[PDB]
Design an enzyme around this catalytic site. Sequence first.
Site: not given
Length: 128
Positions: A35, A46, A50, A52, A59
Site C-alpha cells: 500500500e 482515487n 477520494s 488514500d 480512504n
Amino acid sequence: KVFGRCELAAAMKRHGLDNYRGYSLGNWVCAAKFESNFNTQATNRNTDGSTDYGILQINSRWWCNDGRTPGSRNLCNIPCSALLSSDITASVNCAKKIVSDGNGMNAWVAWRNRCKGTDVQAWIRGCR
Ligand SMILES: [Cl-]
Ligand SMILES: [Cl-]
Ligand SMILES: [Cl-]
Ligand code: NA
C-alpha cells in the site's frame, strides 16, 4: 517516516494489530508494504475523487475527513492528516474498525491481490 520492516512489525504489535480479528502480523506488514512501501506520508488520489492516506492507505470516502470528498463519511472520526503521522496509532485504530466491518482484510484490494494466500509470515521472519 519510512518504517523499517521489523520496526513496523513491532509498532503494529505494540498497538494490538497482531492476530487482530484473526489476521497474523505478517498480513498487516505485507499490506503496508504494497500500500505505502512503509511510508506514513503516502497519499494516492482515487478515480472517484477520494484519497488514500498513510501507511495502510485509508480512504476518505468512508473512514476519515479531508473536506474534499463530496458525500463521504468519517466513520473513524479523524482528519485524514492524522493518518500521515510518524506515530501510527490513528492508522492502527482506524484499521481495526475497517477490518471489523464484514469483509476482513479484503477491504484492502492490495492485500487480496498480493498478500492473500501467500507466505505472509516471511514479512516478519527474522524480526525481534
Ligand atoms: Cl504472520
Ligand atoms: Cl469531505
Ligand atoms: Cl475475516
Ligand atoms: Na470523508
